[PDB]
Amino acid sequence: ADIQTERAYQKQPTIFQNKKRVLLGETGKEKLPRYYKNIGLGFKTPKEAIEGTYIDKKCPFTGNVSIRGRILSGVVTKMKMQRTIVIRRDYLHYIRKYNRFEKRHKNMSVHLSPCFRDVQIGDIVTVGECRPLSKTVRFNVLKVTKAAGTKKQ
Template sequence: MKNIGLNIEQPTTDCDDHHCPFHGQISIRGKLIQAKLIKNKARRTAVVRIEFFHYVKKYMRYEKRRRNIIAHISPCLNVNDNDSVTIGECRPLSKNVSFVVLGRTS
């Protein structure tokens, strides 16, 4: 198990996934985001939702917006739907996947 250089709890189980940040060859660089895991149905892939506020200059108010991000889940991580998770940016793993789930946040 390699040290990814972040203050994130490492998983207890091992895996042989090449895209695992703890056991594989993926390095985390760029953004670290805390979000809510929405769907976990695809194989080793999850949909994560980020909610944020956007300022509307015309009305001098904030509106709530959200964005869905597709992230890779390693089999050594035990996360379920509606969990609060931390995701980290990595190199593009596929056409739409450029983030990896790093673990559950408390």
């Protein structure tokens, strides 16, 4: 549906919709401006977030979250939560006694902005650390790369 599917009204707090639309301007359609920011560190803001209509206060690009700290990647595992997904990170732990490695994993729940519409299970996502968004969410999805696909039969 539209962006008003709840008990409150969503809007980007930096945007004033009611900019005195009088006869000097044709009403309508005066398309409301969209707040968007470059998150830095070389990441490119997606075109969907530039011109989309969704509201997400936790979005890295159209929300009030700043990426700072560690940048790291993972593999999407589940997508059965609202605006947030869990990713699995595989690494090897070294054991000195046996001079061999040990395969370990840690699941991380990360916030997935609606700008990344084209996200399946198994994709590679780069996440950046932000302020705690939920009880167990501290990373926000910055870039989505397909998993040897981009073509579907």
